[PDB]
Write a protein that binds this DNA or RNA. Structure first.
Ligand SMILES: Nc1ncnc2c1ncn2[C@@H]1O[C@H](CSCC[C@H](N)C(=O)O)[C@@H](O)[C@H]1O
Length: 327
DNA sequence: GATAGCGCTATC
DNA sequence: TGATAGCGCTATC
């Protein structure tokens, strides 16, 4: 994550819905904003969250009275995505875990925050002929909010991860925000191998499988993209080996495969999966952030989390627009 | 809960 | 296409 000297969100209050690890909090907090409420129902996520913010998020958002949520200026929410991801069954809103956005929709109805910040996977952008994104857009307009939506890839914001996500920035129409803009991409100068841990710390992660089949020669030069080198088994999810010289693939929350949730990488001749801490770095989390004691949960948490840095550049720009109030 | 084979999708 | 990749799914122990 990046250091932000000029705090654009000082004095502003924000809610952390579907908090997970607190990625949205890490980001807005770096911009000066203050967290007044967090929500997350996963026992384990609540555990890590506390382990890092000394607070315990509140359970099932679908049973919390909106009127109960603290007043706030910015609603952050990277709601569930299993129901919209390229990787899953795409049952969209029909999916039990897919209606959560309407839970946000009604929080906003009550609290009427100055800004609604949301995040989800790229496929949500076009899911079901783009009708999903459209309901969200109209549902937001009908609450009296503008709807700024764009798909950014982490690799375009200082983080070596091919994580493409759709970010939705909604401003209350009353405030007349017109100069909002999404961060401009900038050259990726960091790669997977720059974030790796020393071999001695990742030995236990090394995987040696007879079905290891290297299909591509390691790359000498760093690149702003994922470069597959080899594969194990049938090369399915979590069975693909990539170049540390390139960028990492998308961390997943439920992903399987021998390299479950992180993907395989080639480090000093050995083939291995990433370490939870490496995921953290891959997600833009500061090493000072405490990962969950359970590697599996830790991986899941980082898997469906967000890249802080990206969240920062957006958050900072959110403040700019918010603060630009000439006479 | 943790591990891991998968199998079908979107994209150009 | 043909090749690549995905905050996933779910069976098993
Ligand atoms: N009804 C509900 N109430 C609270 N949290 C819920 C929920 N349904 C799903 N979730 C939570 O939704 C989160 C979606 S992933 C969001 C991750 C988060 N922005 C981060 O940076 O970690 C998960 O942590 C999941 O456990």
């Amino acid at each position: 994550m990046i250091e932000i000297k000029d705090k654009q969100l000082t004095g502003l209050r924000f809610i952390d819905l579907f908090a997970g690890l607190g990625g949205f909090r890490l980001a807005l907090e770096s911009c000066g904003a203050e967290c007044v409420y967090s929500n997350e129902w996963d026992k384990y996520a609540q555990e890590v969250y506390e382990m890092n913010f000394g607070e315990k998020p509140e359970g099932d958002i679908t049973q919390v009275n909106e009127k109960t949520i603290p007043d706030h200026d910015i609603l952050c929410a990277g709601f569930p995505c299993q129901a919209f991801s390229i990787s899953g069954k795409q049952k969209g809103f029909e999916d039990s875990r897919g209606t959560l956005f309407f839970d946000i929709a009604r929080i906003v109805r009550e609290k009427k925050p100055k800004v609604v910040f949301m995040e989800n996977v790229k496929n949500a952008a076009s899911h079901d002929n783009g009708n999903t994104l459209e309901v969200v857009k109209n549902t937001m307009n009908e609450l009296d909010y503008s709807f700024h939506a764009k798909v950014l890839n982490a690799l375009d914001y200082g983080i070596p991860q091919k994580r493409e996500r759709i970010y939705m920035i909604c401003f209350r129409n009353d405030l007349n925000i017109q100069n909002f803009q999404f961060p401009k991409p900038f050259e990726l100068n960091t790669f997977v191998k720059d974030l790796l841990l020393p071999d001695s710390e990742v030995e236990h992660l090394v995987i040696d499988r007879k079905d290891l089949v290297m299909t591509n020669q390691e790359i000498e030069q760093t690149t702003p993209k994922t470069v597959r080198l080899g594969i194990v088994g049938k090369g399915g999810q979590g069975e693909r080996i990539y170049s540390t010289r390139g960028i990492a693939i998308t961390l997943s929350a439920y992903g399987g495969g021998i390299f479950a949730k992180t993907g395989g990488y080639l480090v000093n001749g050995k083939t291995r999966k990433l370490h939870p801490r490496e995921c953290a770095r891959v997600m833009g989390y500061p090493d000072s952030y405490k990962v969950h004691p359970s590697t599996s949960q830790a991986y899941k948490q980082f898997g469906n989390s967000v890249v802080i840095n990206v969240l920062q550049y957006i958050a900072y720009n959110i403040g700019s627009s918010l603060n630009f109030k000439p006479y």
